[PDB]
Design an enzyme around this catalytic site. Structure first.
Site, short mmCIF file in Angstrom:
data_model
loop_
_atom_site.label_atom_id
_atom_site.label_comp_id
_atom_site.label_asym_id
_atom_site.label_seq_id
_atom_site.Cartn_x
_atom_site.Cartn_y
_atom_site.Cartn_z
N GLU A 1 -6.64 -68.94 79.76
CA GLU A 1 -6.61 -68.47 78.39
C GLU A 1 -5.24 -68.64 77.74
OE1 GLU A 1 -8.97 -67.81 76.42
OE2 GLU A 1 -10.66 -67.20 77.67
N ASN B 1 -8.72 -69.30 64.64
CA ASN B 1 -10.02 -69.98 64.54
C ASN B 1 -10.34 -70.08 63.03
OD1 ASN B 1 -10.87 -69.93 67.53
ND2 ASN B 1 -10.47 -67.75 67.13
N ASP C 1 -14.23 -68.94 61.57
CA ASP C 1 -14.61 -67.56 61.28
C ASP C 1 -13.43 -66.65 60.90
OD1 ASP C 1 -13.58 -67.17 63.93
OD2 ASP C 1 -14.93 -65.46 64.21
N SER D 1 -10.84 -65.68 62.51
CA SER D 1 -10.42 -64.71 63.51
C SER D 1 -9.25 -65.31 64.29
CB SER D 1 -11.57 -64.40 64.47
OG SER D 1 -11.98 -65.56 65.19
N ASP E 1 -7.26 -65.13 68.31
CA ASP E 1 -7.29 -64.73 69.71
C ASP E 1 -5.85 -64.35 70.03
OD1 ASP E 1 -9.98 -65.66 70.01
OD2 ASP E 1 -9.17 -67.69 70.04
N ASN F 1 -10.21 -61.62 70.99
CA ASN F 1 -10.54 -61.95 69.61
C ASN F 1 -10.58 -60.81 68.60
OD1 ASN F 1 -12.95 -62.75 67.50
ND2 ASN F 1 -11.60 -64.48 67.99
#
Length: 130
Positions: free
Chosen positions: A35, A46, A49, A51, A53, A60
């Site tokens: 990750e 992202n 959408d 959002s 991370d 998220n």
């Protein structure tokens, strides 16, 4: 900060992650590795959408932490996403624990499914004394 492999392994063990909801420390290590490469400041926006991370586990903002800028999002870990960018990963761990308390468990992270599920993950904890 970027954790050294075994440093992180012992850090996660001390935080109660070994076998948490049946997930071995080696699985948590494999997750953090893929990750963020064990880096606490890692972030990924992202565009689709809106959002983001955050941190070592790339949690998220749509569902887990509040950053105030993700449309219609919730905050299931009840944390400011800022808490997920600290060198001290205690809050990030409490949130990761929250994530796996949901139905999917460790499967919540597609990276774990891609890079860790049904794979030999022993290597992540070898020689760490955990």
């Amino acid at each position: 900060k970027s954790f050294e492999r075994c440093e992180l392994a012992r850090t996660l063990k001390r935080l109660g992650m070994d076998g948490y909801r049946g997930i071995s420390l080696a699985n948590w290590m494999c997750l953090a590795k893929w990750e963020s490469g064990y880096n606490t400041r890692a972030t990924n926006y992202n565009a689709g959408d809106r959002s983001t991370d955050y941190g070592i586990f790339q949690i998220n903002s749509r569902y887990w932490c509040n950053d105030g800028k993700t449309p219609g999002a919730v905050n299931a870990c009840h944390l400011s996403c800022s808490a997920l960018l600290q060198d001290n990963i205690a809050d990030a761990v409490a949130c990761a624990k929250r994530v796996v308390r949901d139905p999917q468990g460790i499967r919540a992270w597609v990276a774990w499914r891609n890079r860790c599920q049904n794979r030999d993950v022993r290597q992540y904890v070898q020689g760490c004394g955990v």
